[PDB]
Amino acid sequence: KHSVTQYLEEIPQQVQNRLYTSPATCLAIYRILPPLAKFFIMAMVFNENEVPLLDLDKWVNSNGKLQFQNAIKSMKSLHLLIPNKSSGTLMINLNPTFKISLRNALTGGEVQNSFGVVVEENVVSLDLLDEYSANKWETILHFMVGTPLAKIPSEKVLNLLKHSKLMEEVNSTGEFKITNEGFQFLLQEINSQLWTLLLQYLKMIETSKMDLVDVLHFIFMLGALEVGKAYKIDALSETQRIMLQDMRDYGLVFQKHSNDSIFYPTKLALMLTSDTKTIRGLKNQDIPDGSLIVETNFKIYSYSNSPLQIAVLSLFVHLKARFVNMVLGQITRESIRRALTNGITADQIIAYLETHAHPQMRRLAEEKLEKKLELDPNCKEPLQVLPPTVVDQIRLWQLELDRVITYEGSLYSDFETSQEYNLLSKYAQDIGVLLWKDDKKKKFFISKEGNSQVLDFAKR
Amino acid sequence: ARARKGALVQCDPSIKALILQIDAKMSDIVLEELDDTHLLVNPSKVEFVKHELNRLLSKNIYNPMD
Amino acid sequence: PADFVPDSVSGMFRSHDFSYLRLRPDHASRPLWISPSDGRIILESFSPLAEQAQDFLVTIAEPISRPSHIHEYKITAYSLYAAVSVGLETDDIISVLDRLSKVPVAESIINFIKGATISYGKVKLVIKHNRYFVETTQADILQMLLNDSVIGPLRIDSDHQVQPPEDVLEREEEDDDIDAVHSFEIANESVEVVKKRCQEIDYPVLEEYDFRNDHRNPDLDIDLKPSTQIRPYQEKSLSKMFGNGRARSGIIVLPCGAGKTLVGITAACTIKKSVIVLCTSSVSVMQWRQQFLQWCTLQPENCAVFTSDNKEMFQTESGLVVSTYSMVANTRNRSHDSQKVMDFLTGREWGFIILDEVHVVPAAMFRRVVSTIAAHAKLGLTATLVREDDKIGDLNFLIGPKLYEANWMELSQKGHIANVQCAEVWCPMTAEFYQEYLRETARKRMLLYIMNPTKFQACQFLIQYHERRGDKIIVFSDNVYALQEYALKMGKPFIYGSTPQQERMNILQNFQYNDQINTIFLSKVGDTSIDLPEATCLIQISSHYGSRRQEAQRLGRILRAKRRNDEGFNAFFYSLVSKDTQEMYYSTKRQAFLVDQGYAFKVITHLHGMENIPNLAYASPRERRELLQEVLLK
């Protein structure tokens, strides 16, 4: 995940405040911050006076102060606040635009932008044009992955995928194949997929006539809630209207026909931030339509099915004959060696199977689960929750095709005494952050959490 | 604030030496060789290092699969 | 050929599509899902009659998959014959399967099931006056007997005679079906023609073996004592093979070395007629006799062992005999003792035959001696599902149908070899090994990647761990120099290449009984020439073993019954493999073979305290290279 939050903090402070002028956007990004920061912000919003940091430390007890660091580093990075070395102390307070916009949103503010929605006869049926939006999303997914016939006409969308290098396909030859980007597209189910696409549209649509403030206003207003009436009519900038038309082309806007009406709030914009239910000529069975099979025997057990979905499954397993409920496919080391040819890491697939194909493995994941977490301390043996036998086989295949071991972090030094190194190592073992250590060399290549906590302890 | 970034490489010393040879063949992009079990490299050329490693292993072993 | 291909016809009926194949309406409400085109049976947890459905499927077919959620179905011609002989109603079984299985019943599968229900294992072979005739209790059997070229044309119109049934039983049809029905007597010439017609027109007849009606054969010097050991699979196989009343010649695949010949001895005593016994080789014949037949009720006083080198009492043995394929019919006829044994075998109508591992020996000699001896019944104690002797005339229809399958998942987990865990430890690579890899591409690299000192370090850690657990360790190491070097390094009593038999027995005693020594290195000299010791921890080093089927035979034999359950995995399998070597491909082949076998498998390369083991001799890659120089001499 490119973690759009990182993109959010990427933009400078003045434009951040530009965005914070739009209260609905303020709320939508409030939805994203880690819970610690959420609570702290909600605290600060009302008492119209800065607050020293010491209190905001003593608020949080131990075993969790790491979340304290997470929150403060995030918020400082995106500069929602302004730390103030007023008297040499720390006088925290938010970007006042943020505070006023948020407080307005909570109690009937003047955010005409967030209130851009119009209430009228929303004759839009649930299935009504919802099926059309789902079909458009499926069509673009298949065309990008590459179907037998890809009717994807998103010339702008195709240009975004190509120039963005969405998938390792030869767009010069018209190929839309799975690259590392293509593999990720195969990985990020909905929020991941929609998010990567939104970021791509951002990067490509960033040169001229952007009005990024209006861009995000439009995006989140789409994600905020059903604007309905007068949306496409009134509630949009000129470039805002163009971007809205483009998004509606991209599926993410379920605008009706006639090319002039209120905003058509497709479920997709909801799907942008919901992290919830994923379900979308006129036939759509109401059930976990996802269909596949993955168990200890390393085989496909598909009774339910979905064409692009089963094709995704095939992207790492052989196909011989599609059947009525089943498709001929058996998952083996060679099956994943097919994707290893693309070099796709056996990482996204793990959580994918834990999440996707569960519409056909509900009972499987339940019997694996068995609520063996509260029962874990009593019965020390977990009952194959998130099957680790297959996990071991997959890891074995990955190593066999891998032959290389890598680690993240940075080299560390200036461990002058063995006492500090040993205490830091013990602390890291307590927190499980030390990949490897040695007092003889006083060096290692791990995450920065232990150094951060020791530095915070020393300085304050 | 001391933190030395780069493509850390950790493997067996034999493969370490082989990778050092390969890297020297491609103009020695290895930033550092921390010890017999760790190397610090610039990530820019690690990909072509892996590519040439694949090329030479295919040349030598050829995978008879007999 | 005198045998029908349908006995070994298993392996088909797995293919389908989605356009022509329609969604089974029972798929909406179907506790199981019998995939007909694939031959599968996806019996999910929604099936409430899962036990009965699994029993029916195992009867008719072979259930390949038994997952926690749903099961799997596989097609087996021998399994089809077993299901037909099961006796369940074909139409009722089809209806029950259609109800439980969500998928609709396929046309071809339904037709096969209907044919197997009546025709399969349900042929009619009448008998008059306690003999073999051309008739049937059902109407179909009588029509087939009347229209049979040998049953009818070679069968006298007389309905039945006591004397003809006893003597002539178109030969003595002791392998006929149930008697005392509408039938007519048959002559005493050409049962070969009758069985050839039955297999050619695909007539699986529910044969019996009326030993008491074998009036020509006097009751041989048989001591009918069942005091030999009896095992659950053994007794159930006996129940299947004895059929109803009189016994019958049949084929049953059994775990060799796990008391395979015990059931054969019991049946041979049961018939109380002329019987002979065959094991793989004459040396193996003696080994099997010594290891069990005196523990068994058999007295070797009558069972003369013939080799064409081991001259024994032929044509004078008062009781049953034990012979071997090499002596019976092979180029290893070093003396005319074998020829005289065959002449005596022709002279006496040996009413039954015991066979052990006939797959190695070509079926040509088997058919030659079948025609030469003109016996009453036989027996196949098979070891492999698919064998080189599955020719046009199948040895099944040459002997009899299948009755029991050596279900190793059932045997090696109930307590015999319970808790079989397998692993493939990847011995870390070193510079010298890959230098040798680049040097040459011949097959001399076997011992070159075998010798890895880290392999011995892992072996020593396993030894000390099993000593701590009080376990038993078996090692497969056919090498000589490297094996002796490792044995010197560990400094404990050890089995090795061409280990003396008395020394091997002493080490086996001190290994399975005493816990001071618990690791034995079995080479390629023993295997099919020595006594298989209890398997608790198996280590494999070499992985050549010809090309194939040697892996299967080694898995069947080296892994023997171990009545120990202290360890959570009472049967460790280990394959110490030098990683990044030539035999990585073949170690993966072994892994695939094992996962096909269904045994629990893993890989433990994160050895706990791998370098913490004592005696880190040759640990350095310099000494690895020196040992590589040593092996280059080998």
Short mmCIF file of C-alpha atoms in Angstrom, two decimals, chain A residues 54-339:
data_model
loop_
_atom_site.label_atom_id
_atom_site.label_comp_id
_atom_site.label_asym_id
_atom_site.label_seq_id
_atom_site.Cartn_x
_atom_site.Cartn_y
_atom_site.Cartn_z
CA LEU A 54 3.47 16.36 29.67
CA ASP A 55 -0.23 15.86 30.27
CA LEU A 56 -0.60 14.14 26.93
CA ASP A 57 2.11 11.76 28.00
CA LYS A 58 0.70 11.05 31.43
CA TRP A 59 -2.64 10.33 29.77
CA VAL A 60 -1.28 7.16 28.21
CA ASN A 61 -0.02 4.40 30.45
CA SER A 62 2.87 2.10 29.59
CA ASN A 63 2.55 -0.87 27.22
CA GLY A 64 1.18 1.29 24.44
CA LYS A 65 3.29 4.43 24.49
CA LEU A 66 4.53 3.18 21.13
CA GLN A 67 1.10 4.20 19.90
CA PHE A 68 1.76 7.56 21.51
CA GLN A 69 4.78 7.90 19.26
CA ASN A 70 2.83 6.65 16.25
CA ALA A 71 0.16 9.27 16.74
CA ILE A 72 2.45 12.20 17.44
CA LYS A 73 4.82 11.41 14.59
CA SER A 74 1.91 11.01 12.18
CA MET A 75 0.21 14.23 13.23
CA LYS A 76 3.44 16.24 13.22
CA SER A 77 4.32 14.78 9.83
CA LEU A 78 1.04 15.96 8.38
CA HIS A 79 1.30 19.10 10.52
CA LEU A 80 -2.31 19.11 11.60
CA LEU A 81 -0.93 20.71 14.76
CA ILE A 82 1.67 23.30 15.64
CA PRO A 83 4.15 22.30 18.35
CA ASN A 84 5.17 25.45 20.20
CA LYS A 85 8.45 25.81 22.09
CA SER A 86 6.78 28.78 23.77
CA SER A 87 8.58 28.80 27.12
CA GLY A 88 10.86 25.96 26.11
CA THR A 89 7.84 23.74 26.75
CA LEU A 90 5.51 22.16 24.19
CA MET A 91 2.28 24.07 23.59
CA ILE A 92 0.41 21.70 21.31
CA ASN A 93 -2.56 22.88 19.25
CA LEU A 94 -3.99 21.95 15.87
CA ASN A 95 -3.85 23.94 12.68
CA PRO A 96 -6.58 26.37 13.72
CA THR A 97 -8.28 25.97 10.37
CA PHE A 98 -8.60 22.28 11.19
CA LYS A 99 -10.09 23.07 14.58
CA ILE A 100 -12.64 25.54 13.29
CA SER A 101 -13.67 23.39 10.33
CA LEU A 102 -14.08 20.29 12.48
CA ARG A 103 -15.98 22.08 15.22
CA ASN A 104 -18.25 23.56 12.58
CA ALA A 105 -18.87 20.07 11.22
CA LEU A 106 -19.78 18.67 14.62
CA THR A 107 -22.29 21.42 15.42
CA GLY A 108 -23.91 22.78 12.27
CA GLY A 109 -21.02 24.63 10.66
CA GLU A 110 -20.91 26.72 7.50
CA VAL A 111 -19.40 24.01 5.27
CA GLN A 112 -21.52 24.59 2.19
CA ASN A 113 -19.12 22.26 0.37
CA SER A 114 -19.83 19.33 2.67
CA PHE A 115 -23.49 20.34 2.46
CA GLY A 116 -23.29 20.35 -1.34
CA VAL A 117 -25.64 17.37 -1.38
CA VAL A 118 -29.23 17.83 -2.54
CA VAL A 119 -32.25 15.94 -1.19
CA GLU A 120 -34.88 15.13 -3.80
CA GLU A 121 -36.65 12.16 -5.38
CA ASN A 122 -33.69 9.76 -5.45
CA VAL A 123 -35.29 7.36 -7.92
CA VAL A 124 -31.97 5.51 -8.05
CA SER A 125 -32.60 1.87 -7.20
CA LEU A 126 -30.18 -0.16 -5.10
CA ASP A 127 -29.57 -2.60 -7.92
CA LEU A 128 -30.61 0.27 -10.20
CA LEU A 129 -27.38 1.45 -11.85
CA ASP A 130 -25.57 -0.21 -8.98
CA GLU A 131 -25.31 -3.24 -11.24
CA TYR A 132 -24.09 -0.90 -13.98
CA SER A 133 -21.36 0.49 -11.72
CA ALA A 134 -20.33 -3.01 -10.70
CA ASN A 135 -20.24 -4.02 -14.36
CA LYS A 136 -18.06 -1.04 -15.26
CA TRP A 137 -15.67 -1.84 -12.41
CA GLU A 138 -15.52 -5.47 -13.52
CA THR A 139 -14.96 -4.41 -17.13
CA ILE A 140 -12.02 -2.19 -16.28
CA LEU A 141 -10.57 -4.82 -13.96
CA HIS A 142 -10.77 -7.47 -16.69
CA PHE A 143 -9.39 -5.16 -19.38
CA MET A 144 -6.45 -4.15 -17.19
CA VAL A 145 -5.75 -7.74 -16.18
CA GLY A 146 -6.51 -8.74 -19.76
CA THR A 147 -9.60 -10.71 -20.69
CA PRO A 148 -10.26 -12.65 -23.90
CA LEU A 149 -12.05 -9.50 -25.09
CA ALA A 150 -11.41 -6.32 -23.09
CA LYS A 151 -14.08 -3.76 -23.98
CA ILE A 152 -12.45 -1.23 -21.63
CA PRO A 153 -12.72 2.08 -23.55
CA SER A 154 -11.24 4.26 -20.77
CA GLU A 155 -8.87 6.10 -23.08
CA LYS A 156 -8.07 8.39 -20.18
CA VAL A 157 -8.14 5.34 -17.92
CA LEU A 158 -5.90 3.38 -20.28
CA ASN A 159 -3.51 6.32 -20.50
CA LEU A 160 -3.43 6.50 -16.71
CA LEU A 161 -2.71 2.78 -16.42
CA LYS A 162 0.04 2.93 -19.04
CA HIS A 163 1.79 6.17 -18.09
CA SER A 164 1.22 5.21 -14.48
CA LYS A 165 2.58 1.77 -15.44
CA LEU A 166 -0.41 0.23 -13.68
CA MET A 167 0.49 -3.31 -14.76
CA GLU A 168 3.51 -4.90 -16.43
CA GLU A 169 1.86 -5.01 -19.84
CA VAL A 170 3.13 -3.76 -23.18
CA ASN A 171 0.74 -0.88 -23.78
CA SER A 172 2.82 -0.10 -26.87
CA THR A 173 1.62 -3.49 -28.09
CA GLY A 174 -1.53 -2.89 -26.05
CA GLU A 175 -0.52 -5.48 -23.46
CA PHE A 176 -2.11 -5.05 -20.02
CA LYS A 177 -0.21 -7.68 -18.05
CA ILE A 178 0.58 -8.26 -14.39
CA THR A 179 3.77 -6.52 -13.30
CA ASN A 180 4.73 -5.71 -9.74
CA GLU A 181 2.03 -3.09 -10.23
CA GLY A 182 -0.07 -5.75 -11.93
CA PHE A 183 0.59 -8.15 -9.07
CA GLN A 184 -0.48 -5.49 -6.57
CA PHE A 185 -3.63 -4.90 -8.62
CA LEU A 186 -4.23 -8.62 -8.29
CA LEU A 187 -3.57 -8.17 -4.56
CA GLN A 188 -5.39 -5.05 -3.32
CA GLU A 189 -8.97 -6.29 -3.29
CA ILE A 190 -11.20 -3.21 -3.28
CA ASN A 191 -9.83 -0.50 -1.03
CA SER A 192 -6.35 -1.33 -2.29
CA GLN A 193 -7.45 -1.40 -5.92
CA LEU A 194 -9.60 1.71 -5.81
CA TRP A 195 -6.88 3.47 -3.84
CA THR A 196 -4.08 2.62 -6.24
CA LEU A 197 -6.26 3.79 -9.09
CA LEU A 198 -7.11 7.05 -7.33
CA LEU A 199 -3.44 7.69 -6.66
CA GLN A 200 -2.67 6.98 -10.31
CA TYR A 201 -5.33 9.44 -11.44
CA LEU A 202 -3.80 11.93 -9.03
CA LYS A 203 -0.29 11.48 -10.38
CA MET A 204 -1.35 11.57 -14.02
CA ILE A 205 -3.96 14.30 -13.47
CA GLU A 206 -1.58 16.68 -11.74
CA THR A 207 -0.04 18.86 -14.46
CA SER A 208 -2.46 21.69 -15.27
CA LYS A 209 -5.93 22.85 -14.25
CA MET A 210 -5.77 20.71 -11.11
CA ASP A 211 -6.98 22.81 -8.17
CA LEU A 212 -5.89 20.05 -5.83
CA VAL A 213 -7.97 21.55 -3.04
CA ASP A 214 -11.05 21.26 -5.23
CA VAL A 215 -9.84 17.83 -6.32
CA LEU A 216 -9.81 16.45 -2.80
CA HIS A 217 -12.99 18.33 -1.97
CA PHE A 218 -14.68 16.52 -4.85
CA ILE A 219 -13.13 13.16 -3.98
CA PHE A 220 -14.12 13.19 -0.33
CA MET A 221 -17.51 14.72 -1.04
CA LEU A 222 -17.96 11.65 -3.21
CA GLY A 223 -16.73 9.52 -0.33
CA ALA A 224 -18.51 11.49 2.37
CA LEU A 225 -22.10 10.48 1.74
CA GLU A 226 -24.85 10.48 -0.87
CA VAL A 227 -24.95 14.02 -2.22
CA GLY A 228 -27.74 13.06 -4.62
CA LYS A 229 -29.55 16.14 -5.83
CA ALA A 230 -27.85 19.03 -7.65
CA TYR A 231 -24.42 17.43 -7.17
CA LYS A 232 -23.43 17.27 -10.82
CA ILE A 233 -25.74 20.23 -11.39
CA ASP A 234 -24.36 22.67 -8.82
CA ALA A 235 -22.03 21.18 -6.21
CA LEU A 236 -18.86 21.05 -8.27
CA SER A 237 -16.13 23.34 -9.52
CA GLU A 238 -15.60 23.75 -13.25
CA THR A 239 -12.45 21.66 -13.08
CA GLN A 240 -14.32 19.97 -10.24
CA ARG A 241 -17.09 19.13 -12.71
CA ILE A 242 -14.57 17.82 -15.24
CA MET A 243 -12.95 15.64 -12.59
CA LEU A 244 -16.38 14.42 -11.54
CA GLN A 245 -17.24 13.43 -15.10
CA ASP A 246 -13.89 11.66 -15.38
CA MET A 247 -14.42 9.78 -12.12
CA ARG A 248 -17.93 8.80 -13.20
CA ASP A 249 -16.27 7.40 -16.30
CA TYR A 250 -13.83 5.56 -14.01
CA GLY A 251 -16.82 3.96 -12.35
CA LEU A 252 -16.20 5.64 -8.99
CA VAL A 253 -19.10 8.00 -9.80
CA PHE A 254 -22.53 6.50 -10.51
CA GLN A 255 -23.84 9.53 -12.39
CA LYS A 256 -27.09 8.93 -14.23
CA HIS A 257 -27.64 9.56 -17.92
CA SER A 258 -28.67 12.86 -19.59
CA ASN A 259 -25.18 14.34 -18.91
CA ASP A 260 -26.70 16.99 -16.61
CA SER A 261 -28.21 16.15 -13.22
CA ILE A 262 -27.43 15.87 -9.51
CA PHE A 263 -24.51 13.70 -8.43
CA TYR A 264 -25.05 9.96 -8.90
CA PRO A 265 -23.64 8.51 -5.66
CA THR A 266 -22.40 5.04 -6.59
CA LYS A 267 -21.52 2.64 -3.79
CA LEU A 268 -17.90 2.75 -4.90
CA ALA A 269 -17.08 6.10 -3.29
CA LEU A 270 -18.49 4.61 -0.12
CA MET A 271 -16.16 1.67 -0.70
CA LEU A 272 -13.24 4.11 -0.87
CA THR A 273 -13.17 4.61 2.88
CA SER A 274 -15.68 2.19 4.40
CA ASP A 275 -13.46 -0.88 4.75
CA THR A 276 -16.66 -2.90 5.05
CA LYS A 277 -18.91 -5.18 2.98
CA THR A 278 -17.55 -5.63 -0.53
CA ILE A 279 -20.57 -6.85 -2.52
CA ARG A 280 -21.80 -4.64 -5.35
CA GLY A 281 -28.11 -8.04 -17.43
CA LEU A 282 -30.23 -8.05 -14.28
CA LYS A 283 -29.09 -11.19 -12.40
CA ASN A 284 -27.01 -11.05 -9.22
CA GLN A 285 -27.41 -13.83 -6.65
CA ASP A 286 -27.40 -12.67 -3.03
CA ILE A 287 -24.65 -14.78 -1.44
CA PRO A 288 -20.86 -14.97 -1.02
CA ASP A 289 -20.45 -15.21 -4.78
CA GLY A 290 -16.70 -15.64 -4.39
CA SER A 291 -15.81 -19.25 -5.02
CA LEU A 292 -12.59 -21.19 -4.54
CA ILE A 293 -11.07 -23.93 -2.38
CA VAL A 294 -7.86 -24.01 -0.35
CA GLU A 295 -7.17 -26.60 2.35
CA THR A 296 -4.45 -28.84 3.78
CA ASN A 297 -4.36 -31.03 0.67
CA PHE A 298 -3.23 -28.09 -1.53
CA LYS A 299 -6.08 -28.26 -4.01
CA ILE A 300 -8.84 -26.07 -5.44
CA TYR A 301 -12.37 -26.83 -4.21
CA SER A 302 -14.57 -24.44 -6.20
CA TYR A 303 -18.35 -24.73 -6.26
CA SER A 304 -19.14 -21.03 -6.38
CA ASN A 305 -17.38 -19.06 -9.08
CA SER A 306 -16.82 -15.65 -10.64
CA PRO A 307 -15.17 -15.29 -14.05
CA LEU A 308 -12.64 -12.56 -13.40
CA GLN A 309 -12.26 -13.85 -9.84
CA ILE A 310 -11.53 -17.39 -10.97
CA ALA A 311 -9.16 -15.95 -13.57
CA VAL A 312 -7.38 -14.20 -10.71
CA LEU A 313 -7.15 -17.56 -8.99
CA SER A 314 -5.73 -19.02 -12.21
CA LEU A 315 -3.06 -16.33 -12.20
CA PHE A 316 -1.17 -18.68 -9.86
CA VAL A 317 -2.66 -22.09 -10.72
CA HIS A 318 -3.22 -24.20 -13.82
CA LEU A 319 -6.46 -24.37 -15.82
CA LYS A 320 -7.53 -27.37 -17.89
CA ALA A 321 -11.33 -27.41 -18.18
CA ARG A 322 -13.82 -24.98 -16.67
CA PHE A 323 -16.71 -26.92 -15.13
CA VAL A 324 -20.21 -25.99 -14.00
CA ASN A 325 -19.39 -25.30 -10.35
CA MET A 326 -15.68 -26.14 -10.53
CA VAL A 327 -12.74 -25.25 -12.75
CA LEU A 328 -9.89 -27.69 -13.33
CA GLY A 329 -7.10 -26.40 -11.11
CA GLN A 330 -4.79 -27.79 -8.42
CA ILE A 331 -2.60 -25.52 -6.31
CA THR A 332 0.95 -26.85 -6.02
CA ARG A 333 4.50 -25.54 -5.86
CA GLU A 334 4.52 -25.24 -9.64
CA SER A 335 1.16 -23.46 -9.51
CA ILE A 336 2.74 -20.65 -7.50
CA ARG A 337 5.96 -21.03 -9.50
CA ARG A 338 3.88 -19.63 -12.34
CA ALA A 339 3.50 -16.37 -10.42
#
